[PDB]
From a paper:
Here we report the crystal structure of Izumo1, which reveals a membrane distal region composed of a four-helix bundle connected to a carboxy-terminal immunoglobulin (Ig)-like domain through a β-hairpin stabilized by disulfide bonds. The structure shows that the Izumo domain consists of a four-helix bundle with a flexible α-helical hook/β-sheet insertion, followed by a β-hairpin that connects the bundle to a seven-stranded Ig-like domain. These features result in an elongated architecture stabilized by five intramolecular disulfide bonds that are conserved in the three Izumo paralogs, and are clearly discernible within the sequence of Spaca6, another sperm surface protein recently reported to be required for gamete fusion. The helical character of the carboxy-terminal half of the Izumo domain, which corresponds to helices α3 and α4 in our structure, was shown to be important for the function of Izumo1. The structure readily explains why mutation of leucine residues to proline interferes with this biological activity by disrupting the fold of the four-helix bundle. Strikingly, structural homology searches revealed a high confidence match between the four-helix bundle of Izumo1 and that of SPECT1, a secreted Plasmodium protein that is essential for host cell traversal by the infective sporozoite form of the parasite (Dali Z-score 6.9, RMSD 3.3 Å over 98 residues). In addition, the β-hairpin of Izumo1 is structurally similar to the extensible β-ribbon of TRAP, another Plasmodium protein that mediates sporozoite gliding and host cell invasion (RMSD 1.4 Å over 19 residues). The presence of solvent-exposed bulk aromatic residues in the Izumo1 four-helix bundle (a feature also observed in SPECT1) and the report that some monoclonal antibodies that target the Izumo domain do not block binding of sperm to the egg but hinder gamete fusion are consistent with the possibility that an additional, as yet unknown, component is required to form a functional fusogenic complex. Our findings suggest that the four-helix bundle of the Izumo domain and SPECT1 may orchestrate analogous fusion-related molecular recognition events at the sperm–egg and parasite–host cell interfaces.
Author numbering: 22 to 256
The structure:
């Protein structure tokens, strides 16, 4: 994906136009660049089987790849290497940066990608072949689970709808908190960007089932959490 970052392409433009003259004879420049560009364009391109894990990467990981690649390309720019050794080390550095990228993508999937164990997440991915930003939808069963909440009388009742991955998810609209009646109907008791609901000075009338549903601009509901609230005596 590094080809998708303006800093990499500008870096290669300066490398070809300015820095190559220092290291190598002019007449071998173009061919060298061809190879360089070829290798830089092969970054992240998928061979099927497992390789699909390199076809797309989040903006942050693309940033890491960009900056390590630029670090090495600058190292070689500043090296005393020339001729055959400069070419050998250049191609080796491209192969090594390709390894670094592969590691960053593999890692990105293991941890960063589809971290949600429930609900629907939306992550901005860069597809490396065409350099296209798309919204990747990690879709799992919308209902995340049921919380058993117990609160003494005249205390604060807090319903926490926040999930780990929520902060990272894209396109989140407001959380909506509903009260689910024994009659099998519900009324919205709150809506807004706050991940939680607070009800003050609860009483037995507040005992019951509650529900939290997070909404998105496009994809749908991101998360649902149900709450079973039992009001205890004051002491
Ligand atoms: C049940 O439903 C009715 C209308 O369907 C609603 O007005 C009422 O407040 C609800 N209350 C209980 C205790 O079920």
């Amino acid at each position: 994906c590094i080809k998708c970052d303006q800093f990499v392409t500008d870096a290669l433009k300066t490398f070809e136009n300015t820095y190559l003259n220092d290291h190598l004879p002019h007449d071998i420049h173009k061919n060298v660049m061809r190879m360089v560009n070829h290798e830089v364009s092969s970054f992240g391109v998928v061979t099927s089987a497992e390789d699909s894990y390199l076809g797309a990467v989040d903006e942050n990981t693309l940033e890491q790849a960009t900056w390590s690649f630029l670090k090495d390309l600058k190292r070689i720019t500043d090296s005393d290497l020339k001729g055959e050794l400069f070419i050998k080390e250049l191609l080796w550095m491209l192969r090594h940066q390709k390894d670094i990228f592969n590691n960053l993508a593999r890692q990105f999937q293991k941890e960063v990608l589809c971290p949600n164990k429930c609900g629907v997440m939306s992550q901005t991915l860069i597809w490396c072949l065409k350099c296209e930003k798309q919204l990747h939808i990690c879709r799992k069963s919308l209902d995340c689970g049921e919380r058993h909440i117990e609160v003494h009388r005249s205390e604060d009742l807090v319903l926490d709808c926040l999930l780990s991955w929520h902060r990272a998810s894209k396109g989140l609209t407001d959380y909506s908190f509903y009260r689910v009646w024994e009659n099998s109907s519900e009324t919205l008791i709150a809506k807004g960007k706050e991940p939680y609901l607070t009800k003050s000075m609860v009483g037995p009338e507040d005992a019951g089932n509650y529900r939290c549903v997070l909404d998105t601009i496009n994809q749908g509901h991101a998360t649902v959490i149900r709450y079973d609230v039992t009001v205890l005596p004051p002491k």
